[PDB]
Amino acid sequence: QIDKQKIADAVKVILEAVGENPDREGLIDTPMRVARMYEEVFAGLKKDPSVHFDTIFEEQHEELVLVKDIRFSSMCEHHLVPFFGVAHVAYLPQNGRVAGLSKLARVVDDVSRRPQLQERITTTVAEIMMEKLKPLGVMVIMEAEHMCMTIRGVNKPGTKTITSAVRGAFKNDDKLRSEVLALIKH
Amino acid sequence: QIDKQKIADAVKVILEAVGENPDREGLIDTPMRVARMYEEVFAGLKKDPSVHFDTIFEEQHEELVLVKDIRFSSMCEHHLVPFFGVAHVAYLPQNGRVAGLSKLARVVDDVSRRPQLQERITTTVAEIMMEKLKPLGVMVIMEAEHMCMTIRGVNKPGTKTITSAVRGAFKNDDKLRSEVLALIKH
Amino acid sequence: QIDKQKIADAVKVILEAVGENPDREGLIDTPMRVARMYEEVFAGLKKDPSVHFDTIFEEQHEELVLVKDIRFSSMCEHHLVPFFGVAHVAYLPQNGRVAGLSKLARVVDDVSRRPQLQERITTTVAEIMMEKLKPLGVMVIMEAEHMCMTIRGVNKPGTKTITSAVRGAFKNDDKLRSEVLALIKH
Amino acid sequence: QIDKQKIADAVKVILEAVGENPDREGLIDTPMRVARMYEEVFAGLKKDPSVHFDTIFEEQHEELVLVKDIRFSSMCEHHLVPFFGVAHVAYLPQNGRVAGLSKLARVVDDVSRRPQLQERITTTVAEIMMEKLKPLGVMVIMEAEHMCMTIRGVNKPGTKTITSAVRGAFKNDDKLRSEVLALIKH
Amino acid sequence: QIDKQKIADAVKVILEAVGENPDREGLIDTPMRVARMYEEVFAGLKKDPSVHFDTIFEEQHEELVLVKDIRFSSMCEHHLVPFFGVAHVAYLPQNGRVAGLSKLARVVDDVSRRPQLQERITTTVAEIMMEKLKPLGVMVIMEAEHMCMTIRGVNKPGTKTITSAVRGAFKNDDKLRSEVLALIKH
Amino acid sequence: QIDKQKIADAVKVILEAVGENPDREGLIDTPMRVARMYEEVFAGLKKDPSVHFDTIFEEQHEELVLVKDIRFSSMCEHHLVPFFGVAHVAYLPQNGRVAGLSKLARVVDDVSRRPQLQERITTTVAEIMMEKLKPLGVMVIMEAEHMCMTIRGVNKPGTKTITSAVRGAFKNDDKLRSEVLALIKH
Amino acid sequence: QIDKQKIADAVKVILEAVGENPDREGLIDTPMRVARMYEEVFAGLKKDPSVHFDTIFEEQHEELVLVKDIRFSSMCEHHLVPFFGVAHVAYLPQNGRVAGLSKLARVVDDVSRRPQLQERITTTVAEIMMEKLKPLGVMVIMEAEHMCMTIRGVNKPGTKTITSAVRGAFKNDDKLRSEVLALIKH
Amino acid sequence: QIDKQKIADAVKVILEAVGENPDREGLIDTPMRVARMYEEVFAGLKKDPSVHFDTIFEEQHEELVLVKDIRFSSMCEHHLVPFFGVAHVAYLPQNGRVAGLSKLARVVDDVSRRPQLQERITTTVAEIMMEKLKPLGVMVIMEAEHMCMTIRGVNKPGTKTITSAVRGAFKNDDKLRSEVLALIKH
Amino acid sequence: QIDKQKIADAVKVILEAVGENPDREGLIDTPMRVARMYEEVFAGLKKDPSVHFDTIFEEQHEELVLVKDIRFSSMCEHHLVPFFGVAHVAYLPQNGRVAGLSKLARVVDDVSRRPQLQERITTTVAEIMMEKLKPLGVMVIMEAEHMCMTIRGVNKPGTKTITSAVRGAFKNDDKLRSEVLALIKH
Amino acid sequence: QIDKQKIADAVKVILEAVGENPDREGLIDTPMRVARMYEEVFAGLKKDPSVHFDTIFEEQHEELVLVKDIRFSSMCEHHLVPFFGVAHVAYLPQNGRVAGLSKLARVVDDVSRRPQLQERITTTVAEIMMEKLKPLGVMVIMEAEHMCMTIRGVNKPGTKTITSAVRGAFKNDDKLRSEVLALIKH
């Protein structure tokens, strides 16, 4: 349970401090709206994201699985402004241990819903999968645009950041990485 | 000069309140970074945006000028989260009073650099142009994506908001409005 | 409070009736999953979708607002299979009554979360807006693909259905309707 | 022969249970429509999909054949909601045994017309080909969007699942797999 | 029931006449395959396409409905070679009479499944809708590529033929036609 | 010389057999039109397609030549319905035996102008080039859509079939094949 | 019959005059090749292009027919270098007089196969249609790129020239012209 | 003839003044290179842009001619930095006076080859055409990107400026302007 | 110096020989226009293309440089009709010898401005770069459309010819060739 | 602090020398505007671009990070005219040393804000990243259009120059380079 009233009070202080009128009609509810938003976008601070893979797995299957264009969003920890884009998750199941698709997506969301670095989301999702799924390998790629960069002095809209994490077989098998990348293009 | 320290204190309170560890390496400078960011993105609170048109050029031309796909960003006043996209600005000069292209962009930026509604940015830019350029008419269209919407519970990425403001000749000449809209399509 | 157990029993009957083995591993949890899904996608049956506009902002703004590409999904009432696409909502505020963007999206979602016709979603959204925003006018357009049609006998993938509802000023002002349509193309 | 009446009764129970009015005009025929739909989309439960290859053409051609962007749809067995996209099927004929294109498509359709996992459709198609075509190798790739995921709480529209099955020469020849993937991009 | 054997005999004659060897492996079954194909693509000769309407529900709904990008194919009556593309069907319901979307598609198919002129398919579909739906108006547009043209001496691949039929209100209201055309672009 | 009258008679029989009125205005000339069309599209039955290379130009150039997006059409031998698309031809010349571009196209056309399998067109073009040009290697890729599949019960519009044939150096040099494939994407 | 030898002698003179060696291997046959090419591309000098409409189809159809993206090429009369692109032809049939598609294309080709101005091709095609089809109106649009301009003098590759001719109803009905233009833009 | 040496001396002074080393390898030849560049890009200062408009008579060449996507570049007179894009020129011939297409392009180039405002290039081109062609009307549109704006502090890459000039019939006939705009979109 | 009058006399002979009226208004100046055109497009016959190739010196720079999408045009030596498209030039500088961009383009133009084969342009540009830059290697790719093929009997518009030449390191390093190809796609 | 007056005097001399009237309204302030512009775009002459590298430490993160489509602009040192496009920067962090994204962009800008060669910007950025981040390797690619080439006699708009620099692991690992290139295309 987040203390929304405490956050709201801080937001009000911020608004006064930047030279705004916190009592004007457009801002009256902003403090609480910001609080509610933080509650939602930082909910992952209160959750172990690995729990979604504590579940019964899907019917046995032994070949590459790739789930691509999984939308995500997060907040840069440096500036607390959103960054957003897609994640692509590929892996080689071992002994038929396959992840429910919606569980995958929940991991990405849960890891994301806290102040982050894209790099840390990428590796964490890869680590959780290695831990919980014990596959022959995993490859995670994330692609995102950072407002940290679009709205600020630097002002570079259209810049995409791309992170990747390879574990297990994907670390040593370039042909496999290469196939994943080809399948992700389309 | 805004009180950055005061803002930083409030941000720290927010980080504790959401359940984060404000002393961890990735957050230690976040309070001050957010304060410096707010100083930059809300600088417009301290500026008259109309000053950029205190220099206008006198060459004699009476026909339509459209500047399209001017990038902008701002922060929704409801949630203090960025929205960003493009502005298109069209006007009918008279007495050859023409706006420098960079001056136009500065007006858009200055109006934008405060907590805003897209609607209000749109009309303000239009009003400033009527006041300072005294053209036969102006038409302003803005197109933007709101993170207010993409990162929150509602979760609708790809939603675009489009606003417009017409003044002078554009208000009564539908053919003219129509031509502008065709030229903006591209 | 939906009787999920009852639904699950009916689903199990359906699975037997189509010639499946409801006791096979891949189907054992299907009855309850379907029940939980129905609870979610038909939640709108228990909600008044108009409540989201019980809070409205007063600004001094009188010009066109268009929110386009709002993703939605629903279930055809004929076949209980999903249809999905986008809604575009345009309105002319009256007396500065402006809708929060997220409130708009919520209305679309809530109206959508029940067995539907696309036509009815379109008009209902429009009606709710006229009633709760009291704008000069509203125009709602929806564009969607129906699985009723992609998977089933007609087998016409790629077919899009487009519905519209105009009220108030949009009903009588063809120029205005025309401008909305141009802005929606881009 | 499916017991449609039994299904229709169960659907009526479901409609009552979710809080709908089964007697309203839009729903009166829904129970039977759903029954007829299930009879069609699950027809594959009554068919051997391998019969379509009981006719094969013998012309000494030994090189790669790829049939790409074969539309398919199916119903997830977990939620009985459609998933749909494209299948790509590549094979290396052996002794000039070539598949009729329409026979290929029929196999995909027939395997699909039952409650499924994408993975199982992929491998089943591949197995049927190896068995009935006896080619040097087969590669099957499927790309699909699951409504299981777009309409439910998880709410991740745009997410694509990609499955693959390689047999014979495609299992050991990475260059060949690579060429197929290039030809599928375009 | 058509006389497939008769057709097969004629096809065999055609194959001998063009200098082919009707006994070679690739052609042995061609006569009967062509017969079965004609039975399917010319099935409309045995059917009344008007029987599919009206699946008319009552809504209280008076606004435009457009179903676009309905795939169709037919055979030119001049050369018995396929032409194919899309149909777009728009109407203004009267007294809340709405057409099932799939019923619309079936009408297009049925009218199409016979030797045709694109022009005739277009008007026939429009007439059937006026007769059976009794709407305020209908507009039908078809867009297609003719192999009559792509494979023959003239050899103009990429040529599209576009036909239209307007009835009722669409005949007199250019604004309405115009809106339909805008919605069909996209 | 083809016996057009004999073909026309057979076409008339086919029209009666399918339940059409052969004497209606749109069909009266169809029998002879179809005969003249068959004369044209099956002209290749009377031609040696290799004669176009009884002509070569000695330049002493040894590097890759690729002619891409050569339009072709043909008739499936299984159903006598058109298929059409593009051919790409690449080769490594040897001793100034470069092929005139129009001579290449003529070979494709000539091989195509008879009842065919896409596979056979692909290999035949490749064989003719090896025989007549004696290059270090050849690679032929064809991409086409089959009406065999778009207009019939299977009904899969947008399906493309891709065939290839490699000879000489292209058979052993995967890097070379790969480069060709890259150059064909653009 | 044209005097190819005379042309070949003139071409040889041209080659000498520009400082080329007419006896080198690549040019030996060029004079006769250019003669044969001129015989083909200027064949329209010997043909009445109107004869293709001496056969008309009668069916009582009165609505708009548009044939778009008809490829053509011609030679500028100013420089004898090719220009090429597409023609779009729209007409309103009168008393059911409809043009065969291939006949239309032939007219465009025949008018084109002589030294031309794009403007003249456009009006000539329109005039022939009014004369031979006696429709309520015709609209012809041509779009082309001129090598007159890409290789020589302006050196402006990508420049398109667009010409139009309206007759009959299209001359007076701007809504109709407008609809044609919309249908051409897809 | 320009005094290049004088320009080169001034450029060298500029390089010293900005803190650069004019003797370093990369700058040694820069002063003369800048001089030669100015000679080329400002050559229009020494020419009468036209100055060269000869026409030919064609019959019922009274209809619209549009030359679109004419590439141009120029230098802003405010900053002496390039701007570039396309010009579109449309006119209604009078009495069959047609412009050579390349002559049009030359006029654009020549007017462009001097320090400019986009507005002035636009009107000048329009005026020259009215004076020298005496058409019923002319419409000129230019679309360009200004480096004045992409490289400087304002920093707005992607911004396009669009100017237009209408004379004669285009000034009073909105339908005509509209048709031009539609044809320019494609 | 070219003898333009001699060429003009030969062109006039050609025009009479093809059955044209050389005294009609559109053709009166054509002989001289064609002469002036040949003077321009064959100017390379009088020029050494290597002579203006100057290098730029960047000390120690050794990494890949690619200049892509360099427009060129030329005339096929077989038919004297234009072909045009793009050249891509990649090289590995040695010891910091780098090519000025405009110098590169000039070499391409100069080699092109004579009757050519695409292959010969390709290798010649490669050779000149080995000679004048002495790089570690060069790769040249050209992509063009030939009117030799679009306007003639063969009639295959859209056909692209692609040539390549590799020297030095690009000859033995397939990875490097591959990277160039990837960079050219975009 | 650069001597703006000196620069302004030189610019005035340049304007006279090219044949312009420096006293005309549009040019009066140009000299000083150019001076102020040079002060801004060449500000990098006074800064060390390596100072911005405040790396961030994330844990032990060792996997690929790519920041792509970073907009940049600079001035060619040869002609002092802008070139602009994108930079892509990829690196393999060592010991968790990661670069702030905005810091990366600042380095690109600072290196760019001086007369440059694209090649030198590319290597300098790469060097700075090796020095300051000490990663396992870096790859920098830049893609730009040069006005040096678009506005001048050579006149080749659309030409892109692509430069690269590889250090550390990217120098020896072609698979890695290849993966970066794929991710940049995407």
Residue numbers in the entry:
A (entry chain A), B (entry chain F), C (entry chain C), D (entry chain B), E (entry chain G), F (entry chain D), ...: 3 to 188
Task: Give me lines lifted from the publication on this model.
More specifically, the imidazole ring of the substrate is hydrolytically opened with the assistance of an essential zinc ion, and the resulting pyrimidine intermediate undergoes an Amadori rearrangement of the carbohydrate side chain followed by ring closure. The enzyme product, dihydroneopterin triphosphate, serves as the first committed intermediate in the biosynthesis of tetrahydro­folate by many microorganisms and as the first committed intermediate in the biosynthesis of tetrahydro­biopterin by animals.
Equilibrium sedimentation yielded a molecular weight of 212 ± 30 kDa. Boundary sedimentation resulted in a sedimentation velocity of 9.6 S. Mass spectrometry revealed the presence of 0.9 moles of zinc per mole of polypeptide. The r.m.s.d. values to previously reported GTP cyclohydrolase I structures were in the range 0.76–1.3 Å for the monomers, whereas r.m.s.d. values in the range 0.12–0.34 Å were found on comparing individual L. monocytogenes GTP cyclohydrolase I monomers. However, no appreciable density representing the essential zinc ions was present, and the two canonical cysteine residues Cys78 and Cys150 that form part of the putative zinc-binding site (for a sequence alignment) were oxidized to the disulfide level; it is most probable that the zinc had been lost owing to the chelating activity of the citrate that was used as a precipitant, and loss of the metal cation had been followed by oxidation of the zinc-chelating cysteine residues. A similar observation had previously been made for crystals of GTP cyclohydrolase I from E. coli that had been exposed to EDTA. In comparison, the Listeria protein appears to be even more sensitive to chelator-induced zinc-ion loss, but a search for other (nonchelating) crystallization conditions has been unsuccessful to date. The residues lining the active-site cavity of the L. monocytogenes protein have high temperature factors, possibly owing to the absence of a divalent cation. The enzyme from L. monocytogenes is similar in terms of sequence and three-dimensional structure to orthologs from eubacteria (E. coli and Yersinia pestis). The structure is also similar to mammalian cyclohydrolase I (rat and mouse), although the mammalian protomers are somewhat longer. Semilogarithmic dose–response curves showed symmetrical, S-shaped features, and the overall Z factor of the screen was 0.87. Three heterocyclic compounds inhibited the L. monocytogenes enzyme with IC50 values in the low double-digit micromolar range while not acting as strong inhibitors of human GTP cyclohydrolase I (for details of the high-throughput assay, see the supporting information).
